[PDB]
Amino acid sequence: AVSKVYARSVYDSRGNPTVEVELTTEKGVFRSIVPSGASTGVHEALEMRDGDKSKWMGKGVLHAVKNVNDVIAPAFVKANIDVKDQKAVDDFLISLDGTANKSKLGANAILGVSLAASRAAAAEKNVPLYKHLADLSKSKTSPYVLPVPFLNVLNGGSHAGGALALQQFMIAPTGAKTFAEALRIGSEVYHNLKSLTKKRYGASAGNVGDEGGVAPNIQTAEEALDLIVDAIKAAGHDGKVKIGLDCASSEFFKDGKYDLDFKNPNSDKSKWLTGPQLADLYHSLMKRYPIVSIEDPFAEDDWEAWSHFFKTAGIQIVADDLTVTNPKRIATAIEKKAADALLLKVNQIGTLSESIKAAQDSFAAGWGVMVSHRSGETEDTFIADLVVGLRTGQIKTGAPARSERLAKLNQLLRIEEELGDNAVFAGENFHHGDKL
Amino acid sequence: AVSKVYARSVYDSRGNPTVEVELTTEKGVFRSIVPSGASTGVHEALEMRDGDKSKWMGKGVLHAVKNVNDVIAPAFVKANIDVKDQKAVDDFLISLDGTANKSKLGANAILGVSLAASRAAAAEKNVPLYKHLADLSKSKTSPYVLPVPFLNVLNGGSHAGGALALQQFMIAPTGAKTFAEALRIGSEVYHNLKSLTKKRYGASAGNVGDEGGVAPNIQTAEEALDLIVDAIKAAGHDGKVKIGLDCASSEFFKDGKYDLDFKNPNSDKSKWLTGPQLADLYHSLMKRYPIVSIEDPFAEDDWEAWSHFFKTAGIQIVADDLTVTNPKRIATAIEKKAADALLLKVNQIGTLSESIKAAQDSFAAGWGVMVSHRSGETEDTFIADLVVGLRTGQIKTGAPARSERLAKLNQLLRIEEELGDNAVFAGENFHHGDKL
Ligand SMILES: O=C(O)[C@@H](CO)OP(=O)(O)O
Ligand SMILES: O=C(O)[C@@H](CO)OP(=O)(O)O
Ligand SMILES: [Mg+2]
Ligand SMILES: [Mg+2]
Ligand SMILES: [Mg+2]
Ligand SMILES: [Mg+2]
């Protein structure tokens, strides 16, 4: 029985406050922390910030925390809910808020309780979190499937001072035999990339972005990709490492056009591209580099652009801001055949149950699911257990630098170790890891 | 009773492997992770690395993990040691190794078992870790003392481009009334710093160093310090935030002299400063800026330079590489009146008992003790409980960015909250927090 529900302010990996929730039962105290994105999609569930410019640059979460302590906590405890029944837990939370976007209590108030409940439930059942998550999602556990880690080793877009528009350049060791090996390989490619970057761009370029990747002043995608390929070869893993991209195109989408030089105040408007034109650029890159995944190639509401490109894409097209882990928007993407992979961000929707449903609907539509961190992470490792529980075969949780990233990767190592021969590595079958 | 001792490889904040130990007792599984420094003091206990350049850039810890699983584990379990008796635990580990620098098993094999044992002991006693650590160190617990955080918000030296020789530039909110306020204030100065750095040096500089601070191409100490002061003022905390430095002078010490431009191959040997001259430079910075602490102003064995400077230092002088958390070296520093504060790094010596002894000897000599993280950290939060348990009043665990840093800071928030009026914030008394 849930005897107590408490919330407090803690700091995320960017030094901004976020919500941490603790749920107490006869099994002990279970803690979950809420992550936070930077450029959140317009359709994401509301992250409640205080807006007090005199405190935390106006990013305090005192209101969200109060909503947990003064509203959710009392009601939840008196309700005597069964933490094992995650749907009941979340229906209770969703009803308490009573808004379509969780704007009343705040998604960052609700999620912490939703996640903590699942941890308390795993303990009551006497099974590791990932196993409980497999039960909640009715996922096959014979055997379990470890995910291919997509490591964001190089930053561009608003995450770099160059002209490079594309935001994330990830590496994916799909050729690895195990997750442990994939992680080692990723670390080696990352370190080789870092040394090469420092040598060609200077020590400063060695500094890392929010997610741990380097962010040198790069001008074109070709330059970035060539650097990554050089790192893969220098590390001695050519043939075992593929590339993933997150264009975050919504950030350079203006007047229904795409400005690949948006970081330039005097960008030549006559060089802005239409949906089909930008798509052609992606095809050129896809033909020259081992790119096996492209996220948010087009704006979050430019459905036509997505559908057009998908017709001849040929590789995994991941939807992030387009779907915001929302089943309703996912249904639209499936009907319009806009993509074939969901970037799963639990805090974009607000509850574990809704996130699981988003994943199930995706898998049912033949889509893949890449569980994802947020640019603003914490020491919380829930998504490590979640990606395993969901048997997706693919996760995006940072470069192999900064512990808000390594914490998840390390947790995956422990899960792998614990499962032994009862688990397999998605490898090249990452797209349909759930079907392995 | 300890039934199992196990070690595995996990990744630190830099993406390099490190040792993670788990001790199993009737109370559960207790996990501790070993941190790792970059330019480790020549006198530090030996960190055992595999040296296989084809694996993890030669930084593998397979040998260390094996020493734990194949050597320490069997003998430790058979010994049936009482985890509450930290001395017995460490005397056993030290004896099993048999070397003065822990080079047989590796300090990174021993420390994990040493720390995990303390966690298991606290659980057995059914008390918070910091409480058990207070008991082991015979520290006062009425009331407890929360530390002033020394946040390394800007990097220099080998940790950045430009000619800036000094390595760490930290802010310390001694003017705060609580630790929670200190952290908020610290986070605000940091964000103001990040924004200012990007505006003056560009996005690139905005990226972070290993410990979370910005690392722009700065040429002089005055340049860096002015930037920090501007951030403090822009944040509205002028007068409440002080500055701490870590010169890491050993990195630019050359046969008796110090080269403030060691990053330049054609450095003018005619401008290299002597101990006394370097001292005048510090005095200049001290009078101009609100600096209240200076770490490693001189080389790890340049004793006379320390003694000379200390005669008129007037502020806290911290020994790091000079003392390497080693009671024997601390005794020398005391006799030479070389400094008045110990930077405590548990992995510099290898065991909790020796670290506690180092702190005690320091306090007995009227020295302050600044518990410290390593540049290579993990999701481990042992030092948060340690600094509280030792009642030191000061900790250095990173800038308010990157979760291997926030993990500790967040843990301190939790401890402060839990203690309530049973704890006080060191504030301006950071130097002698143990005397509150
Ligand atoms: O765009 C994304 O996929 C995420 C993480 O890579 O970033 P944010 O959390 O800022 O939405
Ligand atoms: O010099 C220091 O005090 C530490 C942390 O600031 O760095 P390292 O862990 O590399 O010794
Ligand atoms: Mg976004
Ligand atoms: Mg995205
Ligand atoms: Mg050092
Ligand atoms: Mg130092």
Which of A8, A17, A184 is closest, CB to CB, to B56? A184
What is the resolution of the experimental data for this entry, in Å? 1.8
C-alpha B94/C-alpha B137 separation (Å) is 19
A330 close to A345: Cβ distance less than 8 angstroms: no
Sign of CA dihedral A246, A378, B243, B376: negative
Binary contact (A403, B404; C-beta < 8 A)? yes
C-alpha B250/C-alpha A282 separation (Å) is 50
C-alpha B26/C-alpha B120 separation (Å) is 9
Size of interface A-B (CB pairs under 8 A): 147
- 3-class SS at A293? strand
C-alpha B10/C-alpha B28 separation (Å) is 20
Determine the angle formed by the axes of helices B129-137 and B382-389, rounding to 10 degrees: 50
A289 close to A298: Cβ distance less than 8 angstroms: no
Type of residue at A311: K
CA distances from A179 to A150, A341, A433, B203 (A): 12, 21, 13, 34
**Residue B55 distance to chain A (closest CA, Å):** 8
Sheet holding B368-372, edge to edge: B148-149, B394-396, B368-372, B341-344, B316-319, B291-295, B242-246, B168-172, B151-155
Residue B362: name the closest of B431, B291, B292 by CA: B431
Q: Is A343 in the pocket of ligand 1 (CB under 6 A)?
A: yes
B318 close to B295: Cβ distance less than 8 angstroms: yes
- Looking from the CA of residue A248, the nearest atom of ligand 1 is 1
C-alpha A234/C-alpha A189 separation (Å) is 8
Sign of CA dihedral A226, A228, A233, A239: negative
For residue A54, give both structure tokens. Answer: 């005199």
DSSP string, B52-94: -TTSGGGT--HHHHHIIIIIIHHHHHHHT--TT-HHHHHHHHH
> How many degrees, rounded to 5, is the angle at CA B84 between CA B80 and CA B88?
60
C-alpha A308/C-alpha A296 separation (Å) is 14
Pocket test for ligand 2, best of B150, B344, B374, B402 (most atoms within 8 A of CB): B374
C-alpha A183/C-alpha A67 separation (Å) is 39
Ligand 2 center to A295 CA (angstroms):
38
For chain A, positions 281-320, list CB contacts with chain B under 8 A: none
Q: Which domains does chain B possess?
A: 1-126 (3.30.390.10), 127-436 (3.20.20.120)
The catalytically annotated residue of A59, A242, A345, A408 is A345
Asked if B184 reaches chain A (Cβ–Cβ under 8 Å), the answer is yes
**Residue B333 distance to chain A (closest CA, Å):** 35
For residue A26, give both structure tokens. Answer: 């006869």
How many CA atoms, within 13 angstroms, populate the side-chain half-sphere of residue B324? Answer: 22
Instruction: Kindly report whether the peptide bond that precedes residue A173 is cis, defined as omega within 30 degrees of 0.
Output: no
Binary contact (A15, B406; C-beta < 8 A)? yes
A170 close to A246: Cβ distance less than 8 angstroms: yes
Asked if A400 reaches chain B (Cβ–Cβ under 8 Å), the answer is yes
> How many degrees, rounded to 5, is the angle at CA A112 between CA A111 and CA A114?
60
Backbone angles phi, psi at A201, to 5 degrees: -115, -15
Closest chain B residue to the Cα of A413, Cα to Cα? B10
Which of A20, A204, A400 is closest, CB to CB, to B205? A204
Backbone angles phi, psi at B372, to 5 degrees: -140, 150
Q: Tell me which residue has tokens 């303990």.
A: A123
Asked if B183 reaches chain A (Cβ–Cβ under 8 Å), the answer is yes
C-alpha B215/C-alpha B205 separation (Å) is 6
- 3-class SS at A138? coil
A142 close to B185: Cβ distance less than 8 angstroms: no
Binary contact (A160, B203; C-beta < 8 A)? yes
- Looking from the CA of residue A152, the nearest atom of ligand 1 is 6
